Structure formats: structure tokens, C-alpha cells
Amino acid sequence: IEEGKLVIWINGDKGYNGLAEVGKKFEKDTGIKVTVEHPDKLEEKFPQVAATGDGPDIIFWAHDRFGGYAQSGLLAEITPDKAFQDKLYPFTWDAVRYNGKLIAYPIAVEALSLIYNKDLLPNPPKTWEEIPALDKELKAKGKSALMFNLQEPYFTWPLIAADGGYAFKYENGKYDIKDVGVDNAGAKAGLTFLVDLIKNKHMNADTDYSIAEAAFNKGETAMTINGPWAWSNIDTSKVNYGVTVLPTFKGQPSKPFVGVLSAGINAASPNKELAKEFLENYLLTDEGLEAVNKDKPLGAVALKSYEEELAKDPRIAATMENAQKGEIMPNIPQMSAFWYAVRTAVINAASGRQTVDEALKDAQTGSELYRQSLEIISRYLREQATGAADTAPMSGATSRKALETLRRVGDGVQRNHETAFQGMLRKLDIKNEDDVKSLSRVMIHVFSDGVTNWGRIVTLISFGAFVAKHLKTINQESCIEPLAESITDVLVRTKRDWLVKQRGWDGFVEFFHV
Amino acid sequence: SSTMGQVGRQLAIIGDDINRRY
Numbered sequence A: 001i002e003e004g005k006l007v008i009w010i011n012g013d014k015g016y017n018g019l020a021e022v023g024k025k026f027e028k029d030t031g032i033k034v035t036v037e038h039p040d041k042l043e044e045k046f047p048q049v050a051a052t053g054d055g056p057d058i059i060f061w062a063h064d065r066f067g068g069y070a071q072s073g074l075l076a077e078i079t080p081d082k083a084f085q086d087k088l089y090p091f092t093w094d095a096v097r098y099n100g101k102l103i104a105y106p107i108a109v110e111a112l113s114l115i116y117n118k119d120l121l122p123n124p125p126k127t128w129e130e131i132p133a134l135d136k137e138l139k140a141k142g143k144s145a146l147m148f149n150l151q152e153p154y155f156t157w158p159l160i161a162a163d164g165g166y167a168f169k170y171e172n173g174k175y176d177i178k179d180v181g182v183d184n185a186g187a188k189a190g191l192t193f194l195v196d197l198i199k200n201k202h203m204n205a206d207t208d209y210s211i212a213e214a215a216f217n218k219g220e221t222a223m224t225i226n227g228p229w230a231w232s233n234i235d236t237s238k239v240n241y242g243v244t245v246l247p248t249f250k251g252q253p254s255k256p257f258v259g260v261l262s263a264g265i266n267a268a269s270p271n272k273e274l275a276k277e278f279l280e281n282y283l284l285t286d287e288g289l290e291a292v293n294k295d296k297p298l299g300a301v302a303l304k305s306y307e308e309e310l311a312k313d314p315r316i317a318a319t320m321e322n323a324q325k326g327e328i329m330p331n332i333p334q335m336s337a338f339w340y341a342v343r344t345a346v347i348n349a350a351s352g353r354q355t356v357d358e359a360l361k362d363a364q365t366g367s368e369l370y371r372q373s374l375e376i377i378s379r380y381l382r383e384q385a386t387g388a389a390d391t392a393p394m395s396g397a398t399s400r401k402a403l404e405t406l407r408r409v410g411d412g413v414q415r416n417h418e419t420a421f422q423g424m425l426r427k428l429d430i431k432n433e434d435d436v437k438s439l440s441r442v443m444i445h446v447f448s449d450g451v452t453n454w455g456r457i458v459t460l461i462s463f464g465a466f467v468a469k470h471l472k473t474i475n476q477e478s479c480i481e482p483l484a485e486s487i488t489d490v491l492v493r494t495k496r497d498w499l500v501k502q503r504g505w506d507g508f509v510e511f512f513h514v
Numbered sequence B: 001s002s003t004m005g006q007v008g009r010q011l012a013i014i015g016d017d018i019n020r021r022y
């Protein structure tokens, strides 16, 4: 990471150009160049590169991912003095607090709202239950009632949560990670309603962010569900739109997750003090937040002074009304694995790969297996590639034994089958990031004859280590943990049942015992 | 079966050898 320079990562749907403009005012005053980037999958990439001491100086994401970052040592504790802390709303500081420390600067409060085309639908529905009849009416006219992103569970969560879904139970000052709330009647009722819309052809299971945004901004669909960042492209489209409270389901408010967009500082940055100066004295000011907001609306900002100025905006009022119906996201380190598991459940139910009930029943153990598997497999592939064991801490006994097993068994596979593994690598001709992403097709082919056993599982992880050694060799070391993640995904997404029956990683250690 | 299919199938054969061994 370059000293005397700031590199900032923010998601590509946010106002990164406005933020880069704030960066230019910083550079003007200081000589420090500010580079703003919007990598894909940055919320997964950031912990990967930061773990090796690289990556951006500053990372922007909703607050739900930062607990996991902090737990892994990847974030600097920030040090705002009392006067600065008083300039932002107290509940936004609460969102960026982890094990008693501030780990990020709060920027803005986000919640999803219903966005509707006033020319197609001046009186939008108050209930989800009305949408099928409305869609059938709009189809006779060449239109559709509603399109929104079905590939990210963030967007279906308001409906799942409406009748009782929840992520983790909060009781006695603590989230209880053993009490996950998607395998209950209300969550199932909400997701069933969503899958019925798809089954009856009011919705298409393949709809993603880009498709829904294009349809609404082209006036092809009467409604969408999206956050404040989306308002600016609608302005450009000259669709005449309103932003309103989400529909009710079984008479209950939709309950969107509330995110606080937050800016954390890399623990590996040599520019911590410059980062603090940029965030406190340039970004978190009326003029700094205005430049970002004019690019893509931020929502209800954390800075009291500027939020008072925008609060008259009726679109912000609707955001805050949906937010009050919803719930602030937990920030515990299990949130990443939760989202992995709920994303699979929603996509599986929507597509018919599983029933609604089976899909949500799997989610909890899927999240626990994912988290444990990802750590084991990622640690093995990294130590194989670098020659050095990771000293950071760890379900920890089992994960320690599993990794000891891999050093013996996985190393053994790579010894005995080196000639095969070398020809496989030559044949695949891995050069770049797309090459590595495409290996998920290899992994599925390992299991396509329908057989699963521990030997195939360990061989796939062993080949993953073999490929990872090669990736460091060609200066693509950052691709190692995406590889580990795709191996982990194939195993948990398609072999969850088998892993559970075989006692997971305890069974793995047992099977390969000397 | 194609190139990625061939690799994947050889990984399965190797895995079955390992499975039998252990």
C-alpha cells in the first residue's frame, strides 16, 4: 500500500464520482492523490487482500460486513474526538461499534423503498396481495407490475421478514448465533408468496439488478424496489416516479434491513492519519456529503447538519419510514455466512431447485458449514502457496485438526498425483482472473456422475492448493482466496446433505485418521 | 466431454483412488 496516497473502495452503485471530487479537493489542499475504485464483489475482495496487508486505505460498505473485518484484525480502530462524535447521530455510531470499539465512520442510513411510475400507476398498491391482479391488468397493456433484483437476498428480505423472518435473535444485549430466523412460518410465508409470483409469471427468477433497473427506467414496469442510490438514474430517464412505503404482506409492514454506509480504515494502511483527515474534515461535511449525494443519493446522512437540510425531501421521508418499519442489520462476523446461505435459499426456491420449506430449512447449517469450510480451505490454500502458516486464531479444535489432516493428506495427493495435476494445470492454461473463476465448472464436473466421497472432496481441495501454488508463481496471488471460496461454495451448495450425514469436518478428520 | 470435463473426471478418478486407500 503506497504511503502518501489514499486508495478508496466504494461499491459501483454509489456516488464514486462525487466522492472522487471530494478527493480532488483533498489533493488540492494537501498534495495527496485520492484514487477511488469500485471493484466487483468488493465486500468479499476487501477481506481477501487486506488479510495479506494489501488493498485500499479506506473501504466503504454497509455496516453489516465490518464486524467480520474487525474480528479478523483488518480494521483500524478509528479515533474521533468527542466533538466530532457529537456531529453525527448516536444510533449511527452504534452501528459501527464492535466489541466496544468504533471500527468505521458512519456515512448514511439506507433502506429500500417502493419506487413507482406515476404515469402508469398513480395510486400504487398498498399490499403485496394486490400485485398479481395488477400485473395481469398491466400485461393486457404491454407492461408489468413489478421488477426488482431477485439475485441478492437484500431485496427480498423485506417480504421474508414481514410476517416473522429474522436473521439472528437479539436478547439480553447479544445476538444469539444459534437462533437463526428464516426457518419459521412467517419467513416461509413471505418467500412462498415471492415464489408464487414467479410461478404464475408475474416475476422472472432470473431478474437481476441491471435488468430491473433498465425495465423501470425505460417505463416497462410500473414498480421496482430499490434504495436512494438508484434515484439519480431515474431522474435522467424522465420516468415520473414516486418513492413510497413498501407494500404490506398479511397486513404487516414489509421490514427492510437498514444499512449504515460506513467507511473503515485498513489496519495495514500507513496512511491512517491522512484517512482520518479525509473522512473527518473533507467527506463528513455539508459540502463533502453534497458532492457525493449529487452523484448518487446517499439516503439519510449521519451528519446532523446536512441531514436537516435534506430531510424535507419526500423521498428521504419515505426511506426513513421504511427504515423505521425495518431493523438495523447485525454486524456480527456470522453475517457474511448468513447472507451466503440466505442467497442460496432464495435463489433455490425461486428457481424450483428446492421447495420453499427445504430451502429455508437448509439455510442455518449451510451458513455454519460455509463459514467453517471457508476458513479451513482458505487457510490450507494460502499456507500451501506461501510456505508459511497463518498464526491468527481460529469450532476451532476441529478446524485445527482438519488443517493438520490436509497437510498430510492433501500434501500426499499432490505428491502421488503430481504428474496428473501438472498435466491438468497445463491443459487448463490459467492466466488471469477469468480463468480462475471458470474453474468452478471443473469442480462441478468432479461430482457429475452423482458420486460423493471424502476422497473426491480432499482431492479437489488438494488440486486447489496445487493451483494456488501456481497462482503465486504467476503474480496472481490475490486469486487464491476466490478459488478457495468457489471450492467451498460447490461443496456447501451441492453437498450440504452429504456433509451433514458424514458429520462434517469431524467426519473428515476421522475418515483420514492414520 | 470437453477440456474442463476431462479434468473434472480425472479429479474424480483420483478421488476414488484416495477414497479406496483411506
Ligand SMILES: OC[C@H]1O[C@H](O[C@H]2[C@H](O)[C@@H](O)[C@@H](O)O[C@@H]2CO)[C@H](O)[C@@H](O)[C@@H]1O
Pocket: A011, A013, A043, A062, A063, A064, A065, A110, A152, A153, A154, A155, A259, A339
Ligand atoms: O444481498 C445480501 C447483501 O445485502 C446487503 O447489501 C446491500 C447493501 O447494503 C446496499 O447498500 C446495496 O448495495 O445493495 C446490497 C445488496 O446487493 C448487505 O449489506 C450485504 O452484506 C449482503 O451481502
